[PDB]
Design a protein around this nucleic acid. Structure first.
Lengths: 120, 122, 114, 209, 56, 26
RNA sequence: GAUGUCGGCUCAUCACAUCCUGGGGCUGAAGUAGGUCCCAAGGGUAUGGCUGUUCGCCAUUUAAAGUGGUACGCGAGCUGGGUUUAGAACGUCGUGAGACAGUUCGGUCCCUAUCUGCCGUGGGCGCUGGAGAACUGAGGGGGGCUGCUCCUAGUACGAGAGGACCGGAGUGGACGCAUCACUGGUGUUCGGGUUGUCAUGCCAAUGGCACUGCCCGGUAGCUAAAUGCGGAAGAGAUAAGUGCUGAAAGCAUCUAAGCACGAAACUUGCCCCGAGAUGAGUUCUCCCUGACCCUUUAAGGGUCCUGAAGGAACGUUGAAGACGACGACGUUGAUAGGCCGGGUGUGUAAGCGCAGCGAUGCGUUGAGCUAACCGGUACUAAUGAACCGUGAGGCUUAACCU
RNA sequence: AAUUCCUUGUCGGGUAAGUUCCGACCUGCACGAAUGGCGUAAUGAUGGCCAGGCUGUCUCCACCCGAGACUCAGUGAAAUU
RNA sequence: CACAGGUGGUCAGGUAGAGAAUACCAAGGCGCUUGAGAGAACUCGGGUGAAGGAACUAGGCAAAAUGGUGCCGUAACUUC
RNA sequence: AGGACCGAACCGACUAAUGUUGAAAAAUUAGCGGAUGACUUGUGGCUGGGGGUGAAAGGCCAAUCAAACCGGGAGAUAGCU
């Protein structure tokens, strides 16, 4: 009956979830801004931010894990080289959510999510 | 949790060998039994010389149990094999004169003085 | 949480040896036949592991008198009394359950001896 | 007589060194100052109205802060009444505390059960399961027949059926007070009292002997 | 199971008392750029609490 | 089955008795 | 003018002509055990073997294994074994088609609940200015079982054998309530092991796919077989029953005046619901003290200024939750996520070094990784505003006071 | 006994306990020799009974993963009355 | 019906394998024409289960299990 | 050698679960049987409704068979509703 659990199911079998957040988080770290339905975003913080904290310090093993997940050389290279140092000292909170709200196609709630200081 | 059916090894001589529970004495509806409970018995294999024989009916004090017993510290003995000591149907008092294997301190009581007086351990 | 802690820390033995699974430990628990409170030894290979704090406890399989046995011990309980690691062992697996299934020549474990 | 109002914090064993492992439930018991002293002259009956542990002033509504403005200082999380008999206690936050229970031998604690949220049969009233197989059709766990054919012509009121479960009240009675303790305000009861950790508890000496 | 008689329009109406839509109450606005918006949401311009997120 | 007919039943009781006349004296 | 028939399953409920527990009379009642009858419906009332079986026989229990009604309770809840479809055979009957309360093998069990009922949970409104808390308790439901030794005491009884009455303590079973500390189970959201194959340029090292690929361990949570608790004691009026005083009837007479005992039933005592109890109850606190105009002039209608407590809304969420509800927090802030440290789990990562021809071992190394826990930390997100909510609040009658 | 109504025929085996099962008697209600009798190794998605193994069939259910049921947006039926 | 059905012939890759079984992939083609949230009963399809192991039931129905090759070895009985 | 043997395509239909206003007017999922033959199948051919055909169930002949479908006798008749 659930009490004290933490883990959204999002109507997908566990493999599909893991693959989904994989491709999705890669899309996030790549585009910085991304638009997505709200529960996915809130469930996306938990996936993405730890990668950046993993990336806060270079080492061979850290690249081996950062590549071991996401499985994409361009983004793992993009961390450490770039998004690694760029978070020189933020405690966390790398991502913020911004609810644009309500996609018209099925009236699902929506929100952008982005790295804390895209700035431009 | 010897329960109904359930094959039981014998821990004494008398040579019942394989054994089966058929009732659980202890009032109406009582389900599980063990540790130092009394239960009904029908013998299976039995030794060819035979202090007893196949198709005999008896009572037995369960001794060892796989599910074990606790006692206050929270320790839990768990023997890996079921066993029971045979008794005469009326006089109680086990008909064997030897006791193989370890027995529980939990079995200890007034009339089980006969059993634990034997037995190699605990 | 500090709300507990004060209870648990004052209730732990600190002298317990850092035993490791598969150690051929010998434990001397207390026992009270009635008036007497004599010790009893209990040799055996360790199979389980504690790690809850005050609640921590460890299991010991033995094989005795042709009948294998097991017995958990509450690490901080007074009744446990003496606890010696005796002969050491090495197994590289946190829970040696597969021993319950084995016996005899295959049932052995070998010294770490490092 | 009066009990007090505590806060379950959740379970621990304690060893009695002669050699027994006694489970116990730990309970913080912050002192419970009174807020009002209802009596027959007060239009009603003998009682006391006590508050408890600290609550933020900002949540507190004006009528509330005014209700505490009389007599006893500083609003707690809530309020509870307790019955009296020849118990003389002032309206001033006299701050009744844990030590009051030292004389008591067995106690109560009235909790607030964990919320199952659905029950249904089997989990709730422990109805027996129907055959899991041998051709059972879409009835592996259904409630089963719920009445007589016709001459009642109705399902009787009070029938046992699916519904909300738990999250109500249910007391306990008995419970040894394994250890009253001041300078810390802890109550070591002998285990198993209703309510999730951090839920309010309403403890009283047992009405039973 | 199917009805033995035909429920009245008054009955259907009683069944539809609770179908009514809820008001949005107090619509919210940005303190900088004009823009009314749902509270805790981006304004249609892309403003939110002054700052201009989403350049496009 | 019972049916309520009279001759439909006494045949059965007749069989039930006719066997007992043999089984007794044997 | 298809109300679809035994039995089994789940789920029940009521009657007393009561199997057990409880209370009495009588005895061919010494004791224990009995016997029959009177009162009593609170609780309890077995697993199996054989057969389609309720039944019955039997094995072994138990304080006992109650009889009955409830459409021979219960198929829009389940089962289709019996039984009444079409195939087939035997025995028998008929020349024959076929027939058999004679048998044998194989045979489609439908429904999305409108209303009545029922378990749950909200919305409106009323309760006479409004609101926030806490209660009061009319009424209602829940619970009501019992064994087993030990003590009394080998005592009364008996010649013995045997063996109590009343009165206590302890300890079990069945049953309900509650809970994760223990012991365990699940834990596809944690770690390693491994095969087949594909991919990352390759070696290495990692990922996908094969039921989570096949497994081995395991945190939180949930849970029982886990460990805590529970029936009561007491008080009222009582049945059967026994009585005290005692007339009608100089005696007698439990009764007609009167007076006293008397059981799991009755009403209280334990728990829970509970002022929609429209008879709408009580207690504490809090907020509202501005104008003006038209009449049909009365609980009148406007218009202007005014927006209090509080409410709802929204956002972050909960050991609360289908939905709403209830709880916590919203920048004076630790509600969630993140980050930090621990704990815990897994069992010596990667890299490089060394040994060996090679697998592999060894050293670095109790190393890494670590979900749901704890302890901290404003890093991200809980917005500066609006919206609902009024402006001292009827008549008469009395008592106090002007 | 695919035949036996009376029948849960009697005796033996097997089970703690066996209306079915296997064995034999003959009192064959109403088997019998090409609408065949009695045997039969092999063969059976055949009838009945037994035994080892194995298991949630069960005592007694428990937890988890997916699709429904539930809430939201858009389409939007039916037996009946 | 833009229906989980039906329709004859030829072509036949890589690694495992006895194979056109099967698993994984090439060339090739696909995501099945409502979505999105929640994570309660109940139903459906499955994973695991402490002690016991047919006590279930009309009945071991379903479920669980055995499962490949090389050798060693094999009964009553017979129409060899 | 074989109406041999284990087993895919190929034909078949034993069990159970669903499904029962289904995805489907007979199917799906997991198993099961035959699988060198009394096989399996494409393409045309012929047998006609009191007749066909039938390894025989009274089965099959265009979703219907103890007598097909369409038309005509035809407003068959109906002591019945």
């Amino acid at each position: 009956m659930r009490h004290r659990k933490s883990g959204r199911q999002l109507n997908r079998n566990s493999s599909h979830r893991q693959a989904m957040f994989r491709n999705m988080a890669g899309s996030l770290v790549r585009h910085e801004i991304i638009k997505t339905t709200l529960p996915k975003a809130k469930e996306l913080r938990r996936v993405v931010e730890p990668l950046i904290t993993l990336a806060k310090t270079d080492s061979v093993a850290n690249r081996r894990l950062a590549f071991a997940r996401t499985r994409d050389n361009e983004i793992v290279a993009k961390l450490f080289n770039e998004l690694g140092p760029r978070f020189a000292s933020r405690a966390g909170g790398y991502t913020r959510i911004l609810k644009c709200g309500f996609r018209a196609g099925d009236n699902a709630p929506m929100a952008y999510i982005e790295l804390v200081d895209r700035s431009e | 949790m010897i329960q109904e059916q359930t094959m039981l090894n014998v821990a004494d001589n008398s040579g019942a060998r394989r054994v089966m529970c058929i009732k659980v004495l202890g009032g109406s509806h009582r389900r599980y039994a063990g540790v130092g409970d009394i239960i009904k018995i029908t013998i299976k294999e039995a030794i060819p010389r035979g202090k007893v024989k196949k198709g005999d009916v008896l009572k037995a004090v369960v001794v060892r149990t796989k599910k074990g017993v606790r006692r206050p510290d929270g320790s839990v003995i768990r023997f890996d094999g079921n066993a029971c000591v045979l008794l005469n149907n009326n006089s109680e008092q086990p008909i064997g004169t030897r006791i193989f294997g370890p027995v529980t301190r939990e079995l200890r009581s007034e009339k089980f003085m006969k059993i634990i007086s034997l037995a190699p351990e605990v | 949480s500090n709300i507990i802690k004060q209870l648990e820390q004052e209730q732990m033995k600190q002298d317990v040896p850092s035993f490791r699974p598969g150690d051929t430990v010998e434990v001397k628990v207390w026992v009270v036949e009635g008036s007497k409170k004599r010790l009893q030894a209990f040799e055996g290979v360790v199979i389980a592991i504690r790690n809850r704090g005050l609640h921590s406890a460890f299991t010991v399989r033995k094989i005795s008198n042709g009948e294998g046995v097991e017995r958990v011990f509450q690490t901080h309980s007074p009744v446990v009394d003496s606890i010696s690691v005796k002969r050491r062992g090495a197994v590289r697996k946190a829970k040696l359950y597969y021993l319950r299934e084995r016996t005899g020549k295959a049932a052995r474990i070998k010294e770490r001896l490092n | 007589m009066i009990g007090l109002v505590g806060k379950k914090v959740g379970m621990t064993r304690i060893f009695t060194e002669d050699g027994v492992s006694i489970p116990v439930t730990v309970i913080e018991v912050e002192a419970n100052r009174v807020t009002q002293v209802k009596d027959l002259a007060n239009d009603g009956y003998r009682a006391i109205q006590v508050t408890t542990g600290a609550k933020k002033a900002n949540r507190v509504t004006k009528p509330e802060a005014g209700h505490f403005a009389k007599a006893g200082v500083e609003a707690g999380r809530g309020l509870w009444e307790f019955r009296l008999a020849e118990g003389e206690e002032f309206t001033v936050g006299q701050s009744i505390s844990v030590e009051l229970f030292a004389d008591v031998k067995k106690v109560d604690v009235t909790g607030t059960s964990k919320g199952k949220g659905f029950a249904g049969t089997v989990k709730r009233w422990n109805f027996r399961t129907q055959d899991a197989t041998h051709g059972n059709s879409l009835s592996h766990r259904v409630p089963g027949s719920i009445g007589q054919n016709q001459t009642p012509g109705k399902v009787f009121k009070g029938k046992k059926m699916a519904g909300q479960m738990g999250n109500e009240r249910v007391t306990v009675q008995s419970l040894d007070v394994v250890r009253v303790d001041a300078e810390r305000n802890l109550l070591l009861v002998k285990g198993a009292v209703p309510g999730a950790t951090g839920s309010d508890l309403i403890v009283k000496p047992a009405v039973k002997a | 199971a199917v009805q033995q008689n035909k429920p009245t329009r008054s009955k259907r109406g009683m069944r539809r008392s609770h179908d009514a839509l809820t008001a949005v109450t107090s619509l919210s606005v940005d303190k900088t750029s004009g823009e009314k918006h749902l509270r805790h949401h981006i304004t249609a311009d892309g403003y939110y609490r002054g700052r201009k997120v989403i350049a496009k | 089955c019972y049916g309520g007919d009279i001759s439909r039943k006494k045949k059965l009781l007749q069989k039930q008795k006719e066997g007992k006349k043999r089984m007794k004296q044997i």
